Amino acid sequence: VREPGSQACLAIDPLVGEEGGAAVAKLEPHLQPRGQPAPQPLHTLVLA
Amino acid sequence: AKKEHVPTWLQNTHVYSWPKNKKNILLRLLREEEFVAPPRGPLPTLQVVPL
């Protein structure tokens, strides 16, 4: 008989870098609000 | 409007509802992705432990 002492099997486990991983970022455009005095289209009429 | 009113060939892309998706429309016009993925890191180093 032989003993597995020296030849024992190996388990594996990755060295995950999640602890130092950057996050996913969401973008939102800062709308030029119409609540603030934004301009409007100058629909014109004629006084005949 | 409704989904049926979109011409068939246009249904193969993003369809924006207004004014529901005006922010998404602005992002599309700006040609900027709404979600920015972080850079692809390196493949994790692999550790072996005996049993």
Tokens found for residue A1: 């008989």
- Among chain A residues, the shortest Cα distance to B28 is held by A29
Give the resolution in Å: 3.0
How many whole angstroms separate alpha carbon A27 and alpha carbon B29?
14
Local structure of B5: helix, strand or coil: helix
Q: Find the angle CA(B41)-CA(B47)-CA(B49) to the nearest 5 degrees.
A: 165
Count, in order, helices (H) and strands (E) of chain A. Answer: 0, 2
Method used to determine the 3D structure: cryo-EM
CB within 8 Å: A10 and B51:
yes
Residues from A contacting B (CB-CB < 8 Å) are: 8-17, 21-29, 31
